[PDB]
């Protein structure tokens, strides 16, 4: 019979004071969840496991020297007028390293064949459910390494006020390099964060103030490079007037997934639908931020369409609308939205009351993040998984696929819609 237990929990400080001021993008995450993603590895041959665990521990400490925020803590000051400030103290209080053993549990137990994410996956991460503002006391980075019969799982819990998805995977890429023998990471973070004026920080903000919540389930779908290329051509072929074939591969796929989810739920064609993209500000500010700007730097772009138009209007029209919402996130709108936020600095509510699954769909992560380059010395990973802690939001999480140019999507929806999707030949997934 299989089981799961914790062997040890250890504080990891940076191998070798300063403060970081947080900007609007960072503060918005204070009352939300951590990023919880991890990497699954197969051990074809025998491995000296105590030596592997020790090597991950020491290479983690070496990497933290280059990313001191992950070894620090948040500092929150609450004021009588119900406002607050927040910053990161790089005080080297340390990350947390959790060593767990899943007896009689295997790779294939974790990757159930073309099925749903099994419950064991959520236990491969530590500090599940902890909101980011609890980083005043809790580590900003927790690493759980779980031993399996035929491999290991490396699961990270990262405070979303400190880092977005891009920065999460910058750190993982850099940790893998250090573990492989690199002296320094190949990409060094930019740690000073963005404000329109030096006088803005510390920003003084206020805290506080869903269909089938708690009942959602999670399933992965795989999209080959070919099927993606097929959808891009189709979408661009349907919008000829004014096109140099500028609908991207990702836009076409996301448009296709949106249509497929709505098709499978079978809803009134008068329903209004909201599709939440996160648009990176790094490349869009003038002057742009550094590519390796370490923090949050992205804004919701909300695509809105009637269900009837979404389906009856064709793939290219949906993808064209997405392309246009992305294009409106200009340097002007980023800066004006920032300025407008400073004058009503309220952390957001997570939005409307939803009465069906397709109503509000959140798109997270990106296929541009490097998942399969994370060789720590024992080979590339077999798969990427998240904690699947979320059972509240209808959500699509994007991952680079194992094959060149493919994409894995992790879909969190009611079970019956995920079943319809897996039986829909128009949904052009594979495996
Ligand atoms: C266009 C309309 C008609 O007005 C309206 C109708 C209403 C709505 C559908 C819009 C609101 O209008 C604003 C809206 C987007 C909310 C406020 C947030 O958006 C931020 O709102 C603040 C202001 O409060 C802006 O300044 C930021 O630019 C913006 O980003 C976001 C995030 C950032 C927390 C978001 O989380 C990221 O999901 C992507 C992942 O990749 C990341 O991991 C992850 O963090 C989850 C969704 C969520 C909660 C909601 C939900 C949907 C809302 C409620 O559109």
Residue numbers in the entry: 1 to 16, 23 to 215, 221 to 251, 253 to 443
Provide the publication's sentences verbatim.
AmAT7-3 is a rare multi-site acetyltransferase which acetylate large saponin molecules. We solved the crystal structures of AmAT7-3 and its variant A310G in complex with astragaloside IV, respectively.
A310D/G/R selectively catalyzed the C3′-OH acetylation of 1, while A310F/W specifically favored C4′-OH. In the A310G variant, as the steric hindrance of the methyl group is removed from Ala, L290 was able to move closer to G310, leading to a simultaneous rotation of the sugar ring towards L290. For A310G, O3 was almost perpendicular (92.9°) to the plane where the C = O group is located, while O4 formed an angle of 47.8° with C = O plane. The vertical position was more favorable for the nucleophilic attack reaction. As a result, the O3- acetylation was kinetically favored over the O4- acetylation in AmAT7-3A310G, which was consistent with the biochemical experimental results. QM/MM calculations showed that the energy barrier of the first reaction step was 19.9 kcal/mol for the O3-acetylation and 30.0 kcal/mol for the O4-acetylation, respectively. The A310G variant catalyzed 5 to generate a single product with a conversion rate of 96.3%.
